[PDB]
A = this chain, B = another copy of it.
Amino acid sequence: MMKKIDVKILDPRVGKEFPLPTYATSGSAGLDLRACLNDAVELAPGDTTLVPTGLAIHIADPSLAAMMLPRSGLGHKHGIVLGNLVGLIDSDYQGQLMISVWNRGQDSFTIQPGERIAQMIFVPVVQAEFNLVEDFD
């Protein structure tokens, strides 16, 4: 299923030196996000750093949300994951997309400008309205 989503480029290297996120194959669930940094960031074991993407999206449709996830290789092999575990992006959010990068392992790790450091999926979401009851059926 396909959806056009408005994107605003906030840093002029995004789409040039730091490519825009894209899906590898027609069958990929997620796209890789890149670190928009001026210089490398050394991330010590146990530490968290906030990494900019240099872009904003506007999903706009309240039936859709995005979820940011670690990359599998980085998480398994290097312990490079997300400080909020999963990043939930609201349909009405229009600020810069930010990545909370957390080193959950035992070795220091260099976050390089342009590196594919996390990934993101778009999933349908349902807004609940609670119906108070005394007992369930």
Contact = CB atoms under 8 A, between A and B. Distances in A.
Interface of A: 1-9, 15, 20-21, 23, 25-31, 46, 48, 50, 56-58, 60, 62-65, 69-72, 74-76, 79, 81-94, 100, 102, 104-106, 119, 121-137
A28 B92 contact: yes
Given A29-B65, A91-B27, A137-B60, A124 B127 contact: no
Number of copies: 3
Contacts of A93: 27
Given A26-B62, A88-B121, A132 B7 contact: yes
Given A3-B129, A5-B129, A48-B105, 10 more contacts: A2-B129, A25-B90, A30-B90, A30-B125, A48-B76, A69-B84, A69-B86, A85-B86, A104-B104, A122-B127
